[model samples]
Target: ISNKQVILKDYVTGFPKESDMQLTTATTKLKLPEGSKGVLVKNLYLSCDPYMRSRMTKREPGASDSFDAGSPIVGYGVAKVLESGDPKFKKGDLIWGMTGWEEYSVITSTESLFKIQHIDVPLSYYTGILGMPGMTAYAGFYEICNPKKGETVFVSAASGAVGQLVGQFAKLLGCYVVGSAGSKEKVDLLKNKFGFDKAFNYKEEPDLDAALKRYFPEGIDIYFENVGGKMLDAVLPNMRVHGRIAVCGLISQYNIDEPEGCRNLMYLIIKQVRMQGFLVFSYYHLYEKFLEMVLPAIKEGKLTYVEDVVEGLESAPAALIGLYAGRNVGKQVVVVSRE
Candidate 1:
């Protein structure tokens, strides 16, 4: 059988353009070569993430390298193993991890791939919740924040993958949660759908510091940092003493050549705040713990997960770019195929 892939044209610089990627067709027999010790998977879905932009850029000295040109752009994806030369995996196993932007892929290093044990929920959830974003929120909030009951929580980009989960988690912990999103619709979703106490549209308010002061008259006990820059700057003064901030991502500064500097660093000392950055990979050992914690919530209807899926692999470029523009409503994923 034949397979299709979205191959990268070359390394990207500055902001990424759609022309940087090219869709290519390839054929795979769905079988591994002799002694290859690899797995052949039929990809079902692909994730469009902000981190991918960093991987698209050219390798710099003392800086992380991006994806190799002439190969398919790679990120987190859900796939079903069709064939395997490795002893651990066999035919017809679902896995999610580092996969290429292709219909089928031959993964040599299958250690990074995790078998999907829970499929009762949507498989696409593996790309966001039930996967990295879930872990990001769980560890960032529960571990990094060390949140106490009745804490006032504020999350920027709160309707997003990690942000949405963070808000819900805080709510379950008896925290008073408020979120800020770009659009009124997302803000509404944060409040009504995601169970946030209050949600505001940042676009409608230029003075974000004033908005935070209005929303959190007392002060924020926990801040889930997603969109940084001015939003983060404004959030500083509103933080209470000993407040904890779990910084997972800075989407606002990713595309710019020179990142924006927050003028409120002094508040960290004055308020005695603790802000920490995290990567989901650092805490992979908590996967089982996360699954145990989140699955029941989902099954019992105590939790809600949202996704914004764009149909077709060809539409992936637009879907990816849409995230930076705050165009996605929920967890942004590309539906490669139904399977």
Candidate 2:
């Protein structure tokens, strides 16, 4: 098979179009040149996450380096090592971490790559549940939310990778969980498959605050903020005393030039609520603990994960864009190659 690649065309402002990227073939050898410390990998699956969109914007005061034009964009992915100059890795080892959006990658940062230990589960799981999103739910919920039994929980973007798992975790802890989604299908999946106590289609409910009040009459004890903006304003007033909020994502405002304001933020002070934001990479130390707790739940059928797979590298650009439109039912994964 030919080693083809998709490279970023330039920096973008809003919803990225296919023209923002270019496709080209790699004529170079996959093996690392002499004395190279990098490991050559064959990409298998690529993850499409919302945070990647933020990185596409041009450099600003708080912005990080934008994806370089005329180069393959880097993202979280599952890959198999074909050659390794590093002492720790060997040929034929499967790993998931930061990799290029191409058939092959020469990864220099081995620290981010985690060796796949559980082969019984689907390898693509490494890109989602057993990967970043899983750790996000584990760390963000338990450490940030500090949920208790009988507590009421609410999650925005409820059918997404991190949100789905967080809802299940809250359910396992005997908390009452409610989730909000853009479509009815995702809302159904949240309640039936992911086991959320209740789910609503946010598109149909213009008055989000009224909806929250109707369902959670007693107010939410834990709030998982996924789509900030109007949802945050609505949820703040519905939070119970001493409630906790885990700020996971702001998907709703990702494309806007200027971010919308949340008007009900005063409730944070009045109700004495605690709000915290986290990144999964910062809590990598707790991966073992996450595995110990989540693996069992997955094995015993207590936890369920869904994925929307768009086959082939040719569709990678569209797959990445699908996140903004709520086209994915669960985790967004792209299969690049086999073996």
Report, for every candidate in turn, its global Cα lDDT versus the true structure: 0.87, 0.87
How well does each candidate superpose onto the true structure, as a TM-score?
0.96, 0.96
* lDDT (10s digit) by residue, model 2, range 1-339: 467888998888767887888888877577687887878999999999877887777775684367777889889999999999888998999999999999989898687889997888889888888999989988899889988999999999888889989999999999999999989999889888988999999889979878998889999999998889888988998999999989988777775653488778799999999988877768899998899887887888988899889798899888887875677778999999867
What are the RMSD figures for all models against the true structure? 1.6, 1.5
Worst 10 residues of 2 by lDDT: 57-66
Residue-level lDDT for 277 in candidate 2: 84
Q: Candidate 2: deviation at residue 316, Å? A: 0.7
* lDDT, model 2, position 324: 59
lDDT of 1 at 248: 84
